């Protein structure tokens, strides 16, 4: 019965197993050369930032907000959008939308510079230790004396974020519930792996590792730094700015600085029109000397949504390309792997070319995006036959990029049968374009396969 009023905890029906996720990567790509395309000498290096983009865009939403979900998530991945509500997803699930509700007409995203689209990517906090992401939400198709269910609720509902974590976005520790006055180091410190375990028992065992430090308060930071699962952290003071391509050292428990980008009281400007203005002041500079735009947002809104398509529009895959728009934990992962890794490629015979790498995580838990880009110097597209790539590759696009030759290369170990979790979807929902959509984004996400070309028939 459609017409039926339902009180339903919001539920996603597959989340990637991050539990699961290998730790360490042993990456082997084979390249067999055409016949009159011999090469004398190739060299690799892993680039500064992932997909040879020229600057970064780090992206942290704070405090659980139901906009992260109904707003940002939903504006970057072509979803139903609101002016004034905000959905859950059992609203989406159940075609149960607001009486105002639109889309985009299109996802937001840069590409991957081989031709395949990378959405937009960001981190939201999570009040894990909060019974309020426990609430439910009402579902009442065809209802319109009404449109309470639609309200802003105090924070996400599990079940939003559950979704989320299926398209990459990031978490991060921010207030945990404790009394005010317990909100001592020593008393954050016990607090932390509690919060943990929640987060674990609802992401699929995903660990968060970012704390992104809450109203200045440094007792956050100080018990961060001794829980040895917090690799990352960020504040808008007593941080590091991050340069891309002039750091230089190891970001392990380091603050990078992320700043909010409040307008002038009373001025009529918005956060989005300060980000924007600040991007365009950094662009004005060569890439290398280039701060991050390293942001935090709280409540997400129409002008949120038009500033994404901007950005989109602008240095996204609809203008120059040149951005990578992702979120913190991402970015510590590449990083890291850019310190630690040490791409070499050996001559096998006078036509084939042997490309390893090792991609392995700190010891605390599994990264969670062990994905890289590898320049070939020396290579292009068309001197080569075929490329063929061992098991722990599971994502694999390729060409060429400047005068030289790019390679990326995901490693997540579970990415086909996370592809096929989206294929069953859309094969459950034949009628929703959206959820066709996806299952084309993620199919071309895997390498080329049998099981790639079994989804590709499936979604066809
Ligand atoms: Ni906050």
């Given at each position: 019965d459609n017409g039926k009023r339902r009180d339903v905890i919001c539920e996603t029906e597959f989340?990637?197993?991050?539990?699961?996720?290998?730790?360490?990567?042993?990456?082997e790509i084979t390249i067999h050369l055409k016949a009159d395309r011999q090469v004398g000498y190739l060299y690799t290096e892993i680039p500064t930032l992932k997909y040879n983009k020229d600057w970064l865009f780090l992206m942290t939403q704070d405090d659980c907000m139901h906009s992260a979900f109904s707003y940002t998530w939903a504006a970057i991945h072509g979803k139903p959008?609101?002016?004034?509500?905000?959905?859950?997803?059992?609203?989406?699930?159940?075609?149960?939308?607001?009486?105002?509700?639109?889309?985009?007409?299109?996802?937001?995203?840069?590409?991957?510079?081989?031709?395949?689209?990378?959405?937009?990517?960001?981190?939201?906090?999570?009040?894990?230790?909060?019974?309020?992401?426990?609430?439910?939400?009402?579902?009442?198709?065809?209802?319109?004396?009404?449109?309470?269910?639609?309200?802003?609720?105090?924070?996400?509902?599990?079940?939003?974020?559950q979704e989320m974590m299926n398209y990459g976005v990031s978490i991060a520790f921010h207030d945990l519930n404790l009394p005010d006055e317990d909100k001592t180091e020593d008393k954050l410190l016990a607090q932390f792996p509690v919060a943990q375990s929640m987060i674990r028992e609802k992401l699929n065992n995903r660990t968060c590792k970012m704390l992104a430090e809450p109203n200045g308060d440094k007792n956050y930071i100080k018990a961060a730094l001794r829980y040895d699962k917090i690799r990352t952290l960020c504040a808008q003071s007593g941080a590091t700015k991050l340069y891309p391509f002039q750091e230089n050292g190891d970001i392990e428990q380091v603050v990078i600085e992320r700043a909010f980008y409040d307008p002038p009281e009373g001025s009529g400007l918005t956060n989005p029109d300060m980000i924007k203005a600040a991007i365009?002041?950094?662009?004005?500079?060569?890439?290398?000397?280039?701060?991050?735009?390293?942001?935090?947002?709280?409540?997400?809104?129409?002008?949120?949504?038009?500033?994404?398509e901007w950005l989109n529009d602008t240095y996204g895959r609809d203008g120059?390309?040149?951005?990578?728009?992702?979120?913190?934990?991402?970015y510590y992962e590449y990083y890291y792997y850019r310190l630690h890794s040490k791409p070499e490629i050996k001559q096998v015979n006078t036509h084939t070319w042997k490309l390893t790498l090792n991609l392995n995580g700190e010891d605390s838990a599994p990264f969670y995006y062990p994905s890289v880009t590898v320049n070939i110097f020396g290579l292009k597209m068309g001197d080569i036959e075929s490329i063929k790539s061992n098991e722990d590759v599971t994502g694999l696009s390729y060409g060429d990029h400047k005068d030289f030759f790019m390679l990326n290369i995901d490693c997540r170990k579970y990415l086909a049968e996370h592809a096929e979790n989206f294929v069953k979807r859309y094969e459950a929902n034949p009628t929703d374009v959206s959820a066709k959509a996806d299952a084309n984004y993620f199919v071309n996400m895997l390498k080329d396969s049998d099981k790639k070309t079994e989804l590709k028939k499936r979604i066809e």
């Amino acid at each position: 019965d459609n017409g039926k009023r339902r009180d339903v905890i919001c539920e996603t029906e597959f989340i990637y197993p991050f539990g699961n996720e290998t730790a360490d990567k042993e990456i082997e790509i084979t390249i067999h050369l055409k016949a009159d395309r011999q090469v004398g000498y190739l060299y690799t290096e892993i680039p500064t930032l992932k997909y040879n983009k020229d600057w970064l865009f780090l992206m942290t939403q704070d405090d659980c907000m139901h906009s992260a979900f109904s707003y940002t998530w939903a504006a970057i991945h072509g979803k139903p959008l609101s002016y004034i509500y905000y959905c859950d997803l059992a609203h989406l699930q159940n075609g149960d939308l607001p009486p105002d509700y639109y889309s985009l007409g299109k996802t937001l995203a840069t590409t991957n510079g081989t031709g395949q689209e990378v959405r937009f990517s960001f981190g939201t906090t999570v009040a894990a230790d909060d019974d309020l992401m426990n609430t439910q939400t009402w579902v009442q198709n065809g209802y319109t004396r009404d449109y309470f269910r639609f309200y802003k609720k105090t924070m996400l509902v599990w079940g939003n974020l559950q979704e989320m974590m299926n398209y990459g976005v990031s978490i991060a520790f921010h207030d945990l519930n404790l009394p005010d006055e317990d909100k001592t180091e020593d008393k954050l410190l016990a607090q932390f792996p509690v919060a943990q375990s929640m987060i674990r028992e609802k992401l699929n065992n995903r660990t968060c590792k970012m704390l992104a430090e809450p109203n200045g308060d440094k007792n956050y930071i100080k018990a961060a730094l001794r829980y040895d699962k917090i690799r990352t952290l960020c504040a808008q003071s007593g941080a590091t700015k991050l340069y891309p391509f002039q750091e230089n050292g190891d970001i392990e428990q380091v603050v990078i600085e992320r700043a909010f980008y409040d307008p002038p009281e009373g001025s009529g400007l918005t956060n989005p029109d300060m980000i924007k203005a600040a991007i365009l002041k950094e662009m004005e500079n060569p890439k290398e000397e280039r701060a991050a735009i390293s942001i935090g947002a709280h409540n997400t809104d129409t002008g949120w949504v038009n500033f994404l398509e901007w950005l989109n529009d602008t240095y996204g895959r609809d203008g120059d390309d040149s951005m990578w728009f992702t979120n913190q934990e991402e970015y510590y992962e590449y990083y890291y792997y850019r310190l630690h890794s040490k791409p070499e490629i050996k001559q096998v015979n006078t036509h084939t070319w042997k490309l390893t790498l090792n991609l392995n995580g700190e010891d605390s838990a599994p990264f969670y995006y062990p994905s890289v880009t590898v320049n070939i110097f020396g290579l292009k597209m068309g001197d080569i036959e075929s490329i063929k790539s061992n098991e722990d590759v599971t994502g694999l696009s390729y060409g060429d990029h400047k005068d030289f030759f790019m390679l990326n290369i995901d490693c997540r170990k579970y990415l086909a049968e996370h592809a096929e979790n989206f294929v069953k979807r859309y094969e459950a929902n034949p009628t929703d374009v959206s959820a066709k959509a996806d299952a084309n984004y993620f199919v071309n996400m895997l390498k080329d396969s049998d099981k790639k070309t079994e989804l590709k028939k499936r979604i066809e």
